[PDB]
Amino acid sequence: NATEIRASVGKMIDGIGRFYIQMCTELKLSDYEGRLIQNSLTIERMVLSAFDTGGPIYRRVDGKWRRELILYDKEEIRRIWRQANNGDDATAGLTHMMIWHSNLNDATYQRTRALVRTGMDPRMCSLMQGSTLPRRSGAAGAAVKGVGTMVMELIRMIKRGINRRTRIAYERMCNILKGKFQTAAQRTMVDQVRESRNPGNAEFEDLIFLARSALILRGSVAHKSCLPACVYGSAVASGYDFEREGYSLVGIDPFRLLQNSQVYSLIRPNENPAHKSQLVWMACHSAAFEDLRVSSFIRGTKVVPRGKLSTRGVQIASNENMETMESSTLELRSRYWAIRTRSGGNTSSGQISIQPTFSVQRNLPFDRPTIMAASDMRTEIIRLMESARPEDVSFQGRGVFELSDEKATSPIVPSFDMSNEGSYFF
Protein backbone atom coordinates (compact mmCIF):
# COMPACT_ATOMS: atom_id res chain seq x y z
CA ASN A 1 0.00 0.00 0.00
CA ALA A 2 0.99 3.64 0.62
CA THR A 3 1.84 4.52 4.26
CA GLU A 4 1.52 0.82 5.04
CA ILE A 5 5.11 0.17 3.94
CA ARG A 6 6.80 2.77 6.17
CA ALA A 7 5.05 1.32 9.17
CA SER A 8 6.25 -2.16 8.29
CA VAL A 9 9.82 -1.09 7.88
CA GLY A 10 9.69 1.07 11.01
CA LYS A 11 8.37 -1.86 12.94
CA MET A 12 11.07 -4.11 11.62
CA ILE A 13 13.86 -1.69 12.60
CA ASP A 14 12.05 -1.18 15.88
CA GLY A 15 12.43 -4.90 16.49
CA ILE A 16 16.14 -4.95 15.61
CA GLY A 17 16.75 -1.94 17.92
CA ARG A 18 14.57 -3.27 20.71
CA PHE A 19 16.35 -6.57 20.42
CA TYR A 20 19.95 -5.18 20.52
CA ILE A 21 18.95 -3.14 23.54
CA GLN A 22 18.21 -6.41 25.29
CA MET A 23 21.33 -8.27 24.31
CA CYS A 24 23.34 -5.45 25.82
CA THR A 25 21.54 -5.64 29.08
CA GLU A 26 21.85 -9.46 29.08
CA LEU A 27 25.60 -9.28 28.30
CA LYS A 28 25.61 -6.45 30.82
CA LEU A 29 27.42 -4.02 28.52
CA SER A 30 28.16 -0.40 29.14
CA ASP A 31 26.69 2.43 27.11
CA TYR A 32 29.95 2.97 25.33
CA GLU A 33 30.68 -0.70 24.60
CA GLY A 34 27.14 -1.27 23.35
CA ARG A 35 27.90 1.46 20.81
CA LEU A 36 31.06 -0.45 19.66
CA ILE A 37 30.66 -1.55 16.07
CA GLN A 38 32.84 -4.60 16.68
CA ASN A 39 30.46 -5.66 19.46
CA SER A 40 27.38 -4.94 17.37
CA LEU A 41 28.74 -7.03 14.59
CA THR A 42 29.19 -10.02 16.89
CA ILE A 43 25.59 -9.78 18.15
CA GLU A 44 24.14 -9.66 14.67
CA ARG A 45 26.19 -12.63 13.57
CA MET A 46 24.88 -14.60 16.59
CA VAL A 47 21.22 -14.05 15.80
CA LEU A 48 21.92 -14.95 12.21
CA SER A 49 23.42 -18.27 13.30
CA ALA A 50 20.65 -18.59 15.94
CA PHE A 51 18.46 -19.32 13.00
CA ASP A 52 21.10 -21.30 11.13
CA THR A 53 26.46 -19.91 18.81
CA GLY A 54 29.29 -17.65 19.85
CA GLY A 55 31.29 -14.55 19.11
CA PRO A 56 33.95 -12.15 20.43
CA ILE A 57 32.78 -9.53 22.84
CA TYR A 58 35.12 -6.60 23.35
CA ARG A 59 34.79 -4.69 26.64
CA ARG A 60 36.73 -2.02 28.38
CA VAL A 61 38.45 -3.17 31.58
CA ASP A 62 39.44 -0.21 33.82
CA GLY A 63 42.39 0.94 31.76
CA LYS A 64 42.23 -0.88 28.42
CA TRP A 65 40.26 -3.17 26.16
CA ARG A 66 39.76 -6.96 26.44
CA ARG A 67 38.45 -9.57 24.07
CA GLU A 68 36.12 -12.12 25.61
CA LEU A 69 34.37 -14.92 23.70
CA ILE A 70 30.84 -16.05 24.48
CA LEU A 71 28.69 -19.02 23.67
CA TYR A 72 24.89 -19.20 23.82
CA ASP A 73 22.18 -21.65 22.74
CA LYS A 74 21.01 -21.01 19.21
CA GLU A 75 17.40 -21.38 20.42
CA GLU A 76 17.91 -19.11 23.40
CA ILE A 77 18.95 -16.27 21.11
CA ARG A 78 16.32 -17.48 18.75
CA ARG A 79 13.58 -16.77 21.30
CA ILE A 80 14.81 -13.58 22.84
CA TRP A 81 14.76 -12.22 19.28
CA ARG A 82 11.07 -13.08 19.05
CA GLN A 83 10.31 -10.87 22.10
CA ALA A 84 11.79 -7.71 20.62
CA ASN A 85 9.66 -8.43 17.60
CA ASN A 86 6.53 -8.92 19.74
CA GLY A 87 6.57 -12.64 19.15
CA ASP A 88 6.29 -12.87 15.36
CA ASP A 89 9.12 -14.25 13.23
CA ALA A 90 11.09 -11.36 11.91
CA THR A 91 12.53 -12.53 8.68
CA ALA A 92 12.85 -9.05 7.26
CA GLY A 93 14.74 -8.20 10.46
CA LEU A 94 17.44 -10.78 9.90
CA THR A 95 17.52 -10.45 6.16
CA HIS A 96 18.18 -6.80 6.90
CA MET A 97 21.25 -7.42 8.95
CA MET A 98 22.44 -9.58 6.06
CA ILE A 99 22.25 -6.76 3.55
CA TRP A 100 24.14 -4.58 5.92
CA HIS A 101 26.83 -7.12 6.61
CA SER A 102 26.99 -7.45 2.87
CA ASN A 103 27.36 -3.76 2.11
CA LEU A 104 30.13 -3.69 4.75
CA ASN A 105 31.77 -6.56 2.95
CA ASP A 106 31.25 -5.24 -0.54
CA ALA A 107 33.11 -2.18 0.65
CA THR A 108 35.67 -3.93 2.84
CA TYR A 109 37.05 -6.51 0.35
CA GLN A 110 37.54 -7.02 -3.27
CA ARG A 111 36.35 -10.55 -4.12
CA THR A 112 38.78 -11.34 -7.05
CA ARG A 113 39.86 -14.88 -6.14
CA ALA A 114 36.18 -15.81 -6.55
CA LEU A 115 36.04 -14.10 -9.91
CA VAL A 116 39.23 -15.42 -11.54
CA ARG A 117 38.21 -18.98 -10.82
CA THR A 118 34.87 -18.36 -12.44
CA GLY A 119 36.19 -16.99 -15.75
CA MET A 120 35.18 -13.40 -15.06
CA ASP A 121 37.24 -10.28 -15.68
CA PRO A 122 38.68 -9.49 -12.25
CA ARG A 123 37.85 -5.88 -12.95
CA MET A 124 34.14 -6.45 -13.11
CA CYS A 125 33.93 -5.91 -9.32
CA SER A 126 31.51 -3.03 -10.11
CA LEU A 127 28.92 -5.75 -10.97
CA MET A 128 29.65 -7.84 -7.90
CA GLN A 129 27.27 -6.38 -5.36
CA GLY A 130 25.87 -8.67 -2.76
CA SER A 131 28.08 -11.52 -3.87
CA THR A 132 28.31 -12.37 -0.18
CA LEU A 133 24.59 -12.53 0.49
CA PRO A 134 23.65 -15.82 2.04
CA ARG A 135 21.49 -18.33 0.31
CA ARG A 136 18.63 -17.52 2.77
CA SER A 137 18.54 -13.78 2.11
CA GLY A 138 14.99 -12.55 1.41
CA ALA A 139 13.52 -11.82 -2.01
CA ALA A 140 14.78 -8.35 -1.28
CA GLY A 141 18.28 -9.93 -1.27
CA ALA A 142 18.10 -10.59 -4.97
CA ALA A 143 17.22 -6.92 -5.60
CA VAL A 144 20.48 -5.89 -3.87
CA LYS A 145 22.49 -8.38 -5.93
CA GLY A 146 23.97 -7.17 -9.19
CA VAL A 147 24.74 -8.62 -12.61
CA GLY A 148 28.13 -10.24 -11.89
CA THR A 149 26.78 -11.61 -8.66
CA MET A 150 23.94 -13.08 -10.79
CA VAL A 151 26.19 -14.35 -13.60
CA MET A 152 28.76 -15.91 -11.35
CA GLU A 153 25.94 -17.86 -9.68
CA LEU A 154 24.61 -18.98 -13.00
CA ILE A 155 28.20 -20.00 -14.03
CA ARG A 156 29.22 -21.86 -10.87
CA MET A 157 26.20 -24.05 -11.64
CA ILE A 158 27.49 -24.55 -15.14
CA LYS A 159 30.73 -25.95 -13.63
CA ARG A 160 28.59 -28.27 -11.52
CA GLY A 161 26.57 -29.09 -14.65
CA ILE A 162 29.21 -29.59 -17.28
CA ASN A 163 31.72 -31.33 -15.36
CA ARG A 164 14.85 -31.42 -11.42
CA ARG A 165 15.09 -29.00 -8.45
CA THR A 166 18.01 -27.42 -10.29
CA ARG A 167 16.43 -26.94 -13.69
CA ILE A 168 13.81 -24.74 -11.89
CA ALA A 169 16.42 -22.99 -9.74
CA TYR A 170 18.39 -22.29 -12.91
CA GLU A 171 15.55 -20.66 -14.88
CA ARG A 172 14.46 -18.58 -11.84
CA MET A 173 17.98 -17.53 -10.90
CA CYS A 174 18.26 -16.72 -14.60
CA ASN A 175 15.05 -14.78 -14.70
CA ILE A 176 16.31 -12.58 -11.86
CA LEU A 177 19.24 -11.64 -13.98
CA LYS A 178 16.81 -10.88 -16.81
CA GLY A 179 14.78 -8.42 -14.76
CA LYS A 180 17.88 -6.43 -13.63
CA PHE A 181 18.53 -5.77 -17.28
CA GLN A 182 16.51 -3.03 -18.89
CA THR A 183 17.34 -3.14 -22.61
CA ALA A 184 15.61 -5.36 -25.11
CA ALA A 185 18.93 -6.87 -26.12
CA GLN A 186 20.40 -7.67 -22.67
CA ARG A 187 16.99 -9.21 -21.93
CA THR A 188 16.20 -11.17 -25.05
CA MET A 189 19.62 -12.83 -24.91
CA VAL A 190 19.01 -13.87 -21.31
CA ASP A 191 16.13 -15.90 -22.59
CA GLN A 192 18.32 -17.35 -25.29
CA VAL A 193 20.70 -18.13 -22.46
CA ARG A 194 18.06 -20.36 -20.84
CA GLU A 195 16.22 -21.81 -23.80
CA SER A 196 19.27 -24.08 -24.05
CA ARG A 197 18.73 -27.55 -22.59
CA ASN A 198 22.42 -28.02 -21.68
CA PRO A 199 25.03 -25.89 -19.83
CA GLY A 200 27.53 -25.51 -22.72
CA ASN A 201 30.07 -22.73 -23.37
CA ALA A 202 27.45 -21.65 -25.85
CA GLU A 203 26.04 -20.21 -22.56
CA PHE A 204 29.05 -19.36 -20.46
CA GLU A 205 30.48 -17.53 -23.45
CA ASP A 206 27.20 -15.66 -23.55
CA LEU A 207 26.75 -14.86 -19.85
CA ILE A 208 30.18 -13.27 -19.71
CA PHE A 209 29.13 -11.05 -22.52
CA LEU A 210 26.04 -9.68 -20.72
CA ALA A 211 28.16 -8.98 -17.70
CA ARG A 212 30.58 -7.15 -19.95
CA SER A 213 27.81 -5.10 -21.48
CA ALA A 214 26.47 -4.47 -17.99
CA LEU A 215 29.38 -2.16 -17.40
CA ILE A 216 28.09 0.49 -19.65
CA LEU A 217 24.48 -0.67 -20.12
CA ARG A 218 24.15 -1.28 -16.43
CA GLY A 219 20.93 -2.76 -15.01
CA SER A 220 18.90 -2.06 -11.91
CA VAL A 221 20.40 -2.88 -8.58
CA ALA A 222 18.87 -1.94 -5.24
CA HIS A 223 20.80 0.28 -2.77
CA LYS A 224 19.32 0.12 0.72
CA SER A 225 21.10 1.96 3.49
CA CYS A 226 21.22 -0.64 6.27
CA LEU A 227 22.99 0.64 9.40
CA PRO A 228 24.43 -1.57 12.24
CA ALA A 229 22.37 -2.81 15.13
CA CYS A 230 23.73 -0.49 17.78
CA VAL A 231 22.51 2.47 15.74
CA TYR A 232 18.92 1.24 15.85
CA GLY A 233 18.97 -0.22 19.29
CA SER A 234 20.36 3.09 20.43
CA ALA A 235 17.54 4.95 18.73
CA VAL A 236 14.93 2.56 20.22
CA ALA A 237 16.45 2.97 23.66
CA SER A 238 16.56 6.65 23.15
CA GLY A 239 12.76 6.47 22.93
CA TYR A 240 12.24 6.92 19.17
CA ASP A 241 9.15 5.02 18.07
CA PHE A 242 9.94 3.80 14.58
CA GLU A 243 6.75 2.10 13.57
CA ARG A 244 4.43 4.98 14.50
CA GLU A 245 6.92 7.35 12.89
CA GLY A 246 7.66 5.03 10.04
CA TYR A 247 11.03 4.44 8.39
CA SER A 248 12.67 4.25 4.98
CA LEU A 249 15.93 2.69 3.65
CA VAL A 250 16.01 4.95 0.59
CA GLY A 251 14.72 8.13 2.21
CA ILE A 252 16.36 10.72 4.41
CA ASP A 253 15.27 8.66 7.35
CA PRO A 254 18.59 6.80 7.69
CA PHE A 255 20.69 9.83 6.93
CA ARG A 256 19.29 11.92 9.72
CA LEU A 257 19.41 8.95 12.01
CA LEU A 258 23.17 8.75 11.76
CA GLN A 259 23.36 12.49 12.39
CA ASN A 260 22.01 11.58 15.85
CA SER A 261 23.78 8.33 16.36
CA GLN A 262 27.22 7.77 17.81
CA VAL A 263 29.01 4.56 17.01
CA TYR A 264 32.49 3.62 18.20
CA SER A 265 35.03 1.32 16.63
CA LEU A 266 38.25 -0.41 17.59
CA ILE A 267 41.17 1.04 15.69
CA ARG A 268 44.63 -0.47 15.82
CA PRO A 269 47.83 1.64 16.13
CA ASN A 270 49.13 2.84 12.73
CA GLU A 271 45.48 3.07 11.49
CA ASN A 272 43.59 6.20 10.46
CA PRO A 273 40.45 7.10 12.45
CA ALA A 274 39.13 9.35 9.68
CA HIS A 275 39.68 6.47 7.30
CA LYS A 276 37.90 3.89 9.52
CA SER A 277 34.92 6.18 9.64
CA GLN A 278 34.93 6.66 5.92
CA LEU A 279 34.68 2.95 5.49
CA VAL A 280 31.73 2.18 7.76
CA TRP A 281 30.06 5.21 6.16
CA MET A 282 30.30 3.80 2.69
CA ALA A 283 28.84 0.54 3.97
CA CYS A 284 26.02 2.34 5.75
CA HIS A 285 24.72 3.55 2.33
CA SER A 286 25.80 0.69 0.10
CA ALA A 287 28.12 3.08 -1.63
CA ALA A 288 31.18 1.01 -2.56
CA PHE A 289 30.98 0.91 -6.32
CA GLU A 290 29.55 4.47 -6.15
CA ASP A 291 31.15 7.37 -7.94
CA LEU A 292 33.86 8.50 -5.46
CA ARG A 293 33.09 12.04 -6.65
CA VAL A 294 29.42 12.17 -5.60
CA SER A 295 30.12 10.22 -2.43
CA SER A 296 32.68 12.82 -1.34
CA PHE A 297 30.26 15.43 -2.34
CA ILE A 298 27.59 14.07 -0.09
CA ARG A 299 29.95 13.15 2.66
CA GLY A 300 31.22 16.73 2.62
CA THR A 301 34.74 15.33 2.89
CA LYS A 302 37.22 13.60 0.58
CA VAL A 303 36.32 9.92 0.19
CA VAL A 304 39.72 8.34 -0.34
CA PRO A 305 39.98 5.28 -2.65
CA ARG A 306 40.70 1.68 -1.57
CA GLY A 307 44.45 2.00 -1.71
CA LYS A 308 45.25 5.44 -0.37
CA LEU A 309 43.03 4.25 2.42
CA SER A 310 44.47 3.55 5.93
CA THR A 311 42.75 0.36 7.10
CA ARG A 312 43.10 -3.43 6.70
CA GLY A 313 39.52 -4.26 7.83
CA VAL A 314 36.77 -3.72 10.40
CA GLN A 315 36.58 -6.94 12.39
CA ILE A 316 39.47 -7.78 14.75
CA ALA A 317 41.07 -11.16 13.69
CA SER A 318 41.52 -13.91 16.29
CA ASN A 319 45.34 -13.56 16.19
CA GLU A 320 45.35 -9.79 16.77
CA ASN A 321 46.27 -8.75 20.30
CA MET A 322 44.49 -6.38 22.64
CA GLU A 323 47.48 -4.53 23.82
CA THR A 324 48.13 -2.79 20.49
CA MET A 325 44.49 -1.75 20.25
CA GLU A 326 42.55 1.44 20.53
CA SER A 327 39.13 2.91 20.04
CA SER A 328 38.09 5.96 18.13
CA THR A 329 34.96 7.94 17.40
CA LEU A 330 33.36 7.14 14.02
CA GLU A 331 32.06 10.05 11.88
CA LEU A 332 29.03 8.73 10.01
CA ARG A 333 27.65 12.19 9.20
CA SER A 334 27.51 14.05 5.87
CA ARG A 335 27.00 17.67 4.71
CA TYR A 336 24.03 16.41 2.64
CA TRP A 337 21.74 13.46 1.95
CA ALA A 338 20.45 11.82 -1.14
CA ILE A 339 17.96 9.30 -2.37
CA ARG A 340 19.34 5.86 -2.94
CA THR A 341 18.37 4.25 -6.27
CA ARG A 342 17.80 0.91 -7.95
CA SER A 343 18.21 2.25 -11.46
CA GLY A 344 21.29 2.46 -13.55
CA GLY A 345 20.40 4.68 -16.52
CA ASN A 346 17.34 5.30 -18.77
CA THR A 347 17.01 3.95 -22.33
CA SER A 348 10.33 11.71 -19.70
CA SER A 349 8.04 14.54 -20.96
CA GLY A 350 10.77 17.09 -20.16
CA GLN A 351 13.33 19.22 -21.94
CA ILE A 352 16.35 17.66 -23.81
CA SER A 353 18.24 20.67 -25.14
CA ILE A 354 18.74 24.27 -24.10
CA GLN A 355 17.70 27.20 -26.37
CA PRO A 356 20.31 29.91 -25.92
CA THR A 357 19.06 33.38 -24.98
CA PHE A 358 22.32 35.17 -24.35
CA SER A 359 25.72 35.60 -25.85
CA VAL A 360 28.16 33.95 -23.42
CA GLN A 361 30.79 31.22 -23.20
CA ARG A 362 28.52 28.29 -22.48
CA ASN A 363 28.59 24.58 -23.17
CA LEU A 364 25.22 24.09 -24.74
CA PRO A 365 23.33 21.13 -23.09
CA PHE A 366 21.55 18.38 -25.00
CA ASP A 367 20.85 14.82 -23.97
CA ARG A 368 23.09 12.89 -26.48
CA PRO A 369 21.22 9.57 -25.97
CA THR A 370 17.47 10.04 -26.05
CA ILE A 371 17.97 12.41 -29.06
CA MET A 372 20.11 10.19 -31.29
CA ALA A 373 18.30 7.16 -29.84
CA ALA A 374 15.83 7.49 -32.83
CA SER A 375 17.83 -11.54 -35.29
CA ASP A 376 21.06 -11.52 -33.33
CA MET A 377 21.74 -10.19 -29.84
CA ARG A 378 25.53 -10.10 -29.81
CA THR A 379 25.56 -7.62 -32.67
CA GLU A 380 22.64 -5.46 -31.58
CA ILE A 381 24.22 -5.00 -28.11
CA ILE A 382 27.41 -3.81 -29.65
CA ARG A 383 25.48 -1.19 -31.57
CA LEU A 384 24.02 0.14 -28.32
CA MET A 385 27.37 0.02 -26.50
CA GLU A 386 29.22 1.96 -29.24
CA SER A 387 27.01 4.97 -28.85
CA ALA A 388 27.36 5.38 -25.14
CA ARG A 389 29.83 7.78 -23.59
CA PRO A 390 30.96 8.36 -20.03
CA GLU A 391 30.34 12.09 -20.30
CA ASP A 392 26.58 11.36 -20.66
CA VAL A 393 24.65 12.89 -17.83
CA SER A 394 22.22 10.68 -16.02
CA PHE A 395 19.40 11.31 -13.58
CA GLN A 396 18.64 14.64 -15.15
CA GLY A 397 16.84 16.80 -12.68
CA ARG A 398 17.92 14.92 -9.55
CA GLY A 399 20.19 16.28 -6.90
CA VAL A 400 21.38 16.27 -3.31
CA PHE A 401 19.36 17.59 -0.43
CA GLU A 402 19.90 19.32 2.89
CA LEU A 403 19.21 17.35 6.00
CA SER A 404 17.26 20.27 7.28
CA ASP A 405 15.28 19.81 4.02
CA GLU A 406 13.19 17.05 5.60
CA LYS A 407 11.23 16.78 2.31
CA ALA A 408 13.19 16.52 -0.88
CA THR A 409 12.19 19.91 -2.15
CA SER A 410 15.23 22.01 -2.88
CA PRO A 411 17.73 19.69 -4.70
CA ILE A 412 21.34 20.60 -5.13
CA VAL A 413 23.01 19.33 -8.33
CA PRO A 414 26.78 19.15 -8.18
CA SER A 415 28.73 20.15 -11.16
CA PHE A 416 32.31 18.87 -10.88
CA ASP A 417 34.14 20.86 -13.56
CA MET A 418 37.39 19.81 -11.77
CA SER A 419 40.17 17.16 -11.75
CA ASN A 420 39.55 13.40 -12.01
CA GLU A 421 40.11 13.20 -8.21
CA GLY A 422 39.43 9.54 -8.85
CA SER A 423 35.97 8.14 -9.36
CA TYR A 424 36.97 4.48 -8.82
CA PHE A 425 37.06 3.14 -5.32
CA PHE A 426 39.11 0.14 -6.48
Residue nearer to a copy of itself on the CB measure, 88 or 205: 205
For a copy of itself, the closer CB: 157 or 294: 294
Nearer to a copy of itself, 57 or 304 (CB): 304
CB of residue 340 vs a copy of itself: minimum separation in angstroms? 6
Using N-to-C axis directions, what is the helix angle for 91-108 and 273-284, rounded to 10°? 130
* Inter-residue contact 106 to 131 (CB < 8 Å): yes
Q: CB of residue 345 vs a copy of itself: minimum separation in angstroms?
A: 6
> Of 11 and 340, which CB lies nearer to a copy of itself in the complex structure?
340
Distance CA 255, CA 248 (A): 10
Q: Distance between terminal CA atoms of the chain?
A: 40
Q: Which is nearer to a copy of itself, 27 or 140 (CB)?
A: 140
* Cα 174–Cα 142–Cα 175 angle in degrees, nearest 5: 20
**Whole-number minimum distance, CB 311 to a copy of itself, in Å?**
15
Measured from the CB of residue 228, what is the shortest distance to a copy of itself in angstroms? 18
Alpha helices, DSSP H only, in 163-215? 165-180, 184-192, 201-213
Categorise residue 313: left if φ over 0, alpha if ψ from -120 to 50, beta otherwise: left
CA angle 304, 309, 312 (to 5 degrees): 145
**Phi-psi category of residue 121: left, alpha or beta, with phi > 0 → left and psi -120 to 50 → alpha:** beta
Instruction: Measure the CA–CA gap between 7 and 243, rounded to whole angstroms.
Output: 5
Least CB distance to a copy of itself at residue 241 (A): 28
Closest approach of a copy of itself to the CB of residue 258, in Å: 15
Q: Smaller CB distance to a copy of itself: residue 55 or 399?
A: 399
Residue 244 C-beta: closest distance to a copy of itself, Å: 27
List gaps in the chain by the residue before each (C–N > 2.5 Å): 52, 163, 347, 374
DSSP reduced 3-state for 22: helix
Give 28 or 389: the residue with its C-beta nearer to a copy of itself: 389
Beta strands per DSSP E along 13-161: 54-61, 64-71
Residue number with CB closer to a copy of itself (23 or 120): 120
Closest distance to a copy of itself from the beta carbon of 298 (Å): 6
How would you classify residue 185: left for phi > 0, otherwise alpha for psi between -120 and 50, otherwise beta? alpha
Residues 327, 328, 329, 331, CA torsion sign: negative
By C-beta, is 29 or 292 nearer to a copy of itself? Answer: 292
Nearer Cβ to a copy of itself (48/208): 208
Q: Using CA atoms, how far apart are residues 372 and 120, in angstroms rounded to an integer?
A: 32
8 A C-beta contact, residue 303 and residue 278: yes
What is the C-alpha to C-alpha distance for residues 201 and 158, in angstroms, rounded to an integer? 9
The minimum distance between CB 77 and a copy of itself, in angstroms, equals: 32
**Min separation Cβ 360 and a copy of itself, Å:** 5
